[PDB]
Design a protein around this ligand. Sequence first.
Ligand SMILES: CCCCCCCCCCCCCCCC(=O)O
Ligand SMILES: CCCCCCCCCCCCCCCC(=O)O
Length: 129
Amino acid sequence: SSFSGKYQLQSQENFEAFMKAIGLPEELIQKGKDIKGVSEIVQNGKHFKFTITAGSKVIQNEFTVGEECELETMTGEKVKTVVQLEGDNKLVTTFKNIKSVTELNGDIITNTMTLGDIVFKRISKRIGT
Ligand SMILES: CCCCCCCCCCCCCCCC(=O)O
Ligand SMILES: CCCCCCCCCCCCCCCC(=O)O
């Protein structure tokens, strides 16, 4: 259960540019750019559940490492992909030509999403249990 916990965004880079590019409606971009969203992760072996909350908007997802899964993404689009572990503390997946890497270092999770030259980076910190 390496990843299990509750974490809140501390800061992020290129939210607006990234979200516009992938189809987030601009009213959502404007309300969302300064939201410090909360990620809740339950890991049980290869099985993951996570909830992302960003004011009024709650996305729940689940996947088993190494297997096909269906992920609901930022716009609501559901994509079929595979999430892999690269060691105990790093989740890697690709969907819609976006490469997503989620890495845990103690209490800090860094999420990097790359779409072409745009690198959307989010840094979050554990908040309690
Ligand atoms: C009422 C305010 C509207 C909020 C809508 C804007 C939220 C868009 C952001 C989606 C949640 C963040 C997804 C990040 C996923 C991750 O990095 O792995
Ligand atoms: C909801 C957007 C799709 C998510 C694509 C990555 C999913 C595989 C790994 C899940 C990591 C969840 C990210 C929590 C860290 C954070 O909020 O920045």
